[PDB]
Design a protein around this ligand. Structure first.
Ligand SMILES: CCCCCCCCCCCCCC(=O)OC[C@H](COP(=O)([O-])OCC[N+](C)(C)C)OC(=O)CCCCCCCCCCCCC
Ligand SMILES: CCCCCCCCCCCCCC(=O)OC[C@H](COP(=O)([O-])OCC[N+](C)(C)C)OC(=O)CCCCCCCCCCCCC
Ligand SMILES: CCCCCCCCCCCCCC(=O)OC[C@H](COP(=O)([O-])OCC[N+](C)(C)C)OC(=O)CCCCCCCCCCCCC
Ligand SMILES: CCCCCCCCCCCCCC(=O)OC[C@H](COP(=O)([O-])OCC[N+](C)(C)C)OC(=O)CCCCCCCCCCCCC
Ligand SMILES: CCCCCCCCCCCCCC(=O)OC[C@H](COP(=O)([O-])OCC[N+](C)(C)C)OC(=O)CCCCCCCCCCCCC
Ligand SMILES: CCCCCCCCCCCCCC(=O)OC[C@H](COP(=O)([O-])OCC[N+](C)(C)C)OC(=O)CCCCCCCCCCCCC
Ligand SMILES: CCCCCCCCCCCCCC(=O)OC[C@H](COP(=O)([O-])OCC[N+](C)(C)C)OC(=O)CCCCCCCCCCCCC
Ligand SMILES: [Ca+2]
Ligand SMILES: [Ca+2]
Ligand SMILES: [Ca+2]
Ligand SMILES: [Ca+2]
Ligand SMILES: [Ca+2]
Lengths: 338, 338, 338, 338, 338
């Protein structure tokens, strides 16, 4: 993701005008290639019309240009594209809200699971590891970035998410469907064992651990759902057709006809169709933003930093439950004490 | 459902343009039959006008064409169709969010319900079976796909969702209304029996089981609600009338009048009304998407894979609570251990 | 309600086109009377203009017709009516989501409240009855259908919702405001008595019962809120004025002027203003849908089946907690067992 | 609030047309004064133009009228006003959903807090009083109606919400900020004392009491938030400017020019600009509805009955926990018993 | 923030018209500098056109003015700006809802954590301090105002949020990422220690403390998310380009051409383009409101009073748990007692 929230903390002169000079995560980066293809086609058509067609061919071309410019408005481009973009943006933020953070769980696993010995350490680390393993198994499914980082389960084994025992146990349980759900069943059985073994003192704390873990399940499930149930392919096809039809008809309708013939609206020849390029910038940029956001777990500049999230989550989880377990700052009176 | 989320992970040149070449779940599949009927009617009208009407009849037809094309905009097609489609898409995603997944419950039933003997196995399998049975009873009500798979309760008996004892007990409890609610009462009474019999060690875990099961009830109830309370038939009728009236008036208003008479906007005869066909594609495609999504539990390409969900849920539930109960990977220090 | 969800399970040719031939719950049923009044007024005005006015009177009428048709667009009918309808539809579905279903509670009352003797039966039936009584007291307030079924509390007594003791106890507690809240206080005091008397074994189950009951309270409260706080009367008045002003000005603006005088847009006389009737169908139908949905607890075809819900809820609640208490199907291994 | 939900239970002929004849809470009441000022200004301008200006002055005035009527559409009145009104209506209903009702809490305080003696009565009444006191302290902050009823804390003391001891304890704790939060800390410390003193038998019930009370806190906090964080003053200023600029330009643009000069659109002089008055009714009425709803805790006809809510809440709370504690109807078999 | 909720409690004549005379938090303050730059450029262009260009240059300029004014509508300024502003306003209110208030937690810490001695005081103050420290660590990240108040952790130490021991313990745990999460792990380990040490009597109260604290975590996480995941930079760039392109083309298209040449729409020269300035006020004001709200934790007039919130929260938390612990008003019968 490209963050600029600090830069726009206060309304000031120009404001978003300083943001126009940004390349990474910008509309220019998303639009230049399609724009250059449109620019080439437009000028090829202009050159064909001006230096290839005969007089009667030029008259026919001019009729077709006035016809196309007249029936540009039949295309409900605003209608279709507005609907599509609102759908994509809603889904994008819903996808971000369902990224699982183990912080609520790691605080409970650090507090409730007793023992400063080797076995307590191992139990706490393995519980949070199950939480982080569940998240990374769902993320490698839903994220092309994470999958490229972890092409197989053995890659998770060499990265600390999975032990060899865990790996072979998952291979034994292999089912045709996705097996991201397994660490939750592992977490429940391990936490029950811990409670029965006296490492968890009361089953109310055990209830509290399982609720936090199940919250993460529900978030992972939402991620699974957004990956599986795409925006209906009909809508993507329709909005794609709307944008392409609009600019394909602009390739002819927005030519500068011979100003000698004094057609209404064609009196002045400016060579560069500035307003047509502005409409391309707005409409195609708008579509290209939707193309970027439709799967926010790709490798786009403004896609979520899913690998960063995975690494941070595992580091913070292991710190919080191993080194921070019953390690507290000395409790001393504050500055406002008396 | 047709999933393409991986294909659109990154914004790239064309992007959704590769999706235009997809047939399954496509706008072409939804539109071709209605489009071919519209195409036939339009050209029949053109041929009648050009080779059947006399001169004065042609003048009257031309007057009617200019009148119809002038009063095409009285039809609030964008207004009505936008409202309808937003309603349908909201309901569609709400319907997906209320598909019950037993994962939260199966982890609790695997952890809390004690015993590696025959009776423990049987108790855990029957509890998750009650959850899966409740889901399949509601789904066969709300889903034509599931109902075709399970025309009667005996079909559920031969598929492992229902035992003969369960089947005869449901026949004894028969009420005029839908009896999807029964497995929840079975689950509560069995879980209470389990707790009293010592298979559940503490009533806090019993509370936790009943909360998860009741969550699934609330999801099933939402599914029942969306199946029963249709989008008001007035709205479907109105949007249907709007789209059909628009294209029925286009059948005459969008004819290419005699270019000899030099009517304004009718100077050029292109035979093929490209913009009228594009408007058909946008508006009728938009309606046909709503027709597909209005009941997402049908047998449409882009409808939910409800049978797949049912089979997966039962397989994963039974695995998680029977074979995964107190079967844990050997707890060994991770790669980051020290 | 009129349900057609099964009929529209798959996108097919015509699709909603088979729904056009439905009378119950249809736009035709909602529109015919107002439409027939509009049809009579329009033709009366046409006949007055054509067979009553003198030549100079006809010229003045024609001026007024062209003026009215020109300033039809000043009326923000789409603006106002779109806002109103989105408000009504949101509130309509929110009202449905807050219909209380005792299923979550009846499963807990069947499981937790112990005793197969007379006193256990009586206690379980009275607890669910308090839940159903609270719902029917709020529903008879918010629903004209339920109130017509139960004009007084004695009608609830003869229908099994209320005992004579309960009736006289409510008469003793009479307050100026609505007393739907009383069964919740009864439920809490009875459930506490049950727990102290040993019919509920652990206060965690007692907590679980009170949470479910309080959920139903919060739903009933929402119903109370939607009944009391109407859509602001200003909005209903404004949208009513917008629709009526639009069609009152159409009564004159949409007349077919003398085609002899060759007014622009009045060249062709079709007698029947098809597009004006289509606009009536869209706009007035749209308003009439809002009039139907604004109170979904009336006796409209597409209003909620509140009496059906009340009867079903009481039947299912009493079955679930009396006949289904500790009556379980014989637990036998499933088909997938081994 | 003005409630008419019963009146609109069924769609019928006219429907909202009977609501047009309502004065209290009506658009007429909100619009008449501004409308009468607009009506006076319009006719003053007409009289100045017709009986004060010379011929060349009349020509200049007519030029300015045609200019103004031409550039009326530059004002994005629909854009701005639609955005503003959707914001206001969302906030209005969110404000209503966060009015705290003690019903969930009063049922728990009636059930859990034991003792039919003086001390039990006093403890239960004081707990619900803390809940009602917290609500009335936040409401007198956010509601001008409640503040006028209770100008000082001593007014709360004479109305039964606050005891003299409670009053002096709040005066001792005085902080620069609002002290609505204090009764929640009182409720928690009193409920803990009650539990330690054996009036609450189990800490699970104590947990249940504190959760309900904290829910009311979160609702009161939302009310505090909506009172403090106004709709941004920029939006109110902009929508105010949009509506006023539109009608100030209508004062000249919508004059009926001399019909002798036969200006396009000015052929017919009707003296009364019916469509301009209709646009005033729609747009200014729409703004005035937003002005009414922007603070729903004022003394407007359609503002919430906050004083009624406060009185009802205290009466019902005290009844439910004092007179209804362990007072149950005799449990007798229902009509459906056997 | 600028609050005026009390001022608009009732709909009255003018209403928001008294708000037009407000400078702090006003549209005038947000618009004047950009407006003055636009005003200078417009009049410079007018003076160049009127007193610098030759006759043929004036004809060319007039052609370009009529071209620009004709193709002003190609810019989807309403489309783009409406989408952007709805996104910003949603995010703004979501950001406010996720400001953490310790009131729910401080009531539980005051009630549950026992002891009127030094150690009880110290334990209660340190628990709420951990809650307030977590909030201030996230706020100094997401808020430029708080960061300017607390440039380093030592500034938090001198302000009472952090003890020197806490400061050195955080320095020892330093990770590359943000360490706002640490006080939650501290809170969980301290609350567990308190429970084991008998200061918390039952683990149900311990569960209740950890749930409240974890709620605050989830709110802080949302704040972190809104700070990190900006509105996509593509949208800000596009809306910026739309507004600037619209007014840059207005600089030429909205000039008053020579009225001698009697161009259509240019008959009257008013020197001041009132409607162009009104459109600037609406559109640029609308953008500038979005610029103000996009980061509501800056130092803008209408930005959240985050420093005030932080100070209030710490003062109220410390009061509630130290001075208000087991300090209750004398429980005496209320005015309605009997
Ligand atoms: C071609 C179509 C549109 C593309 C043009 C986009 C404009 C480019 C602006 C880029 C700003 C440079 C960044 C910077 O560092 O510079 C910001 C500067 C300080 O602050 C300012 O932006 C100073 C001026 C503040 C705003 C200008 C007046 C606003 C009126 C709208 C347009 C009419 C101009 C008179
Ligand atoms: C008839 C009305 C509309 C229907 C036409 C729809 C267009 C069909 C495109 C189908 C793409 C084929 C799939 C593929 O495998 O090919 C993708 C290719 C690599 O990537 C590309 O699509 C290469 C070009 C990238 C986009 C083209 C420029 C965008 C400007 C808009 C239109 C103006 C054209 C100059
Ligand atoms: C007066 C203004 C509008 C009112 C007219 C509404 C149309 C009435 C249709 C009613 C369908 C009868 C029900 C049925 O049982 O019959 C469904 C039939 C099989 O399936 C079909 O509906 C067969 C044809 C499929 C759709 C027709 C082509 C769609 C193109 C739009 C209009 C242009 C027509 C060429
Ligand atoms: C704008 C003014 C429109 C006014 C309506 C015109 C009159 C319509 C037919 C007369 C009313 C039907 C009476 C009835 O009691 O009919 C029952 C029956 C089953 O109705 P069901 O399908 O709900 O079961 O009706 C059927 O024959 C099935 C449905 C027949 C009604 C729909 C006709 C299509 C278009 C009408 C508009 C012209
Ligand atoms: C000046 C601009 C608009 C202002 C006019 C607003 C209209 C005033 C209606 C007030 C109804 C009186 C209340 C009542 O007690 O009377 C309701 C009556 C029974 O039910 C009816 O309203 C009987 C007739 C049902 C509706 C009339 C036909 C609807 C077509 C739209 C307009 C064209 C008229 C032919
Ligand atoms: C744009 C400017 C509009 C200004 C309004 C014109 C004057 C309206 C009548 C005078 C005010 C009524 C005074 C009052 O105190 O009246 C009470 C009474 C019951 O009112 P209630 O039904 O709320 O009970 O009013 C009734 O007679 C029932 C309702 C009567 C008022 C509604 C009249 C319909 C259209 C008025 C617009 C012209
Ligand atoms: C240049 C483009 C727009 C800018 C003009 C904005 C108007 C400025 C109003 C400022 C109010 C001053 C504050 C105050 O203390 O004074 C409020 C006064 C009492 O209450 C009133 O505002 C008394 C009159 C109530 C509203 C006026 C009639 C509304 C009709 C719309 C416009 C047509 C005017 C005839
Ligand atoms: Ca992407
Ligand atoms: Ca379907
Ligand atoms: Ca109704
Ligand atoms: Ca108000
Ligand atoms: Ca700001």
């Amino acid at each position: 993701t490209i963050t600029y929230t600090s830069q726009v903390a206060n309304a000031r002169l120009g404001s978003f005008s300083r943001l126009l000079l940004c390349w990474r995560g910008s509309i220019y980066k998303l639009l230049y290639g399609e724009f250059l293809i449109f620019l080439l086609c437009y000028y090829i058509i202009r050159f064909i019309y001006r230096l290839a067609l005969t007089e009667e061919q030029q008259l026919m071309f001019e009729k077709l240009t006035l016809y196309c410019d007249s029936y540009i408005q039949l295309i409900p481009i605003s209608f279709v594209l507005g609907f599509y973009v609102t759908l994509v943006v809603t889904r994008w933020w819903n996808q971000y809200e369902n990224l699982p953070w183990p912080d609520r769980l790691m605080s409970l696993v650090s507090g409730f699971v007793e023992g400063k010995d080797e076995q307590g350490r191992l139990l706490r680390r393995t519980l949070i590891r199950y939480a982080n393993l569940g998240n990374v198994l769902i993320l490698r499914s839903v994220s092309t970035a994470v999958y490229k980082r972890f092409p197989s389960a053995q890659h998770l084994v060499q990265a600390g998410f999975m032990t060899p025992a865990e790996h072979k146990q998952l291979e034994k349980l292999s089912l045709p469907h996705n097996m991201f759900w397994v660490p939750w069943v592992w977490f429940a059985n391990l936490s029950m064992k811990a409670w029965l073994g006296g490492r968890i003192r009361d089953p109310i704390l055990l209830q509290s651990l399982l609720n936090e873990m199940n919250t993460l399940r529900t978030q992972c499930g939402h991620l699974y759902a957004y990956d599986w149930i795409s925006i209906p392919l009909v809508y993507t096809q329709v909005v794609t057709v709307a944008v392409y039809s609009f600019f394909l008809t602009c390739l002819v309708g927005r030519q500068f006809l011979n100003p000698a013939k004094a057609y209404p609206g064609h009196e002045l020849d400016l060579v560069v169709p500035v307003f047509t390029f502005l409409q391309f910038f707005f409409y195609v940029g708008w579509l290209k933003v939707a193309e970027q956001l439709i799967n926010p777990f790709g490798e786009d500049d403004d896609d979520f930093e899913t690998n960063w999230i995975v690494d941070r989550n595992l580091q913070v989880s292991l710190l919080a439950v191993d080194e921070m377990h019953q390690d507290l700052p000395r409790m001393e009176p504050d500055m406002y004490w008396n």
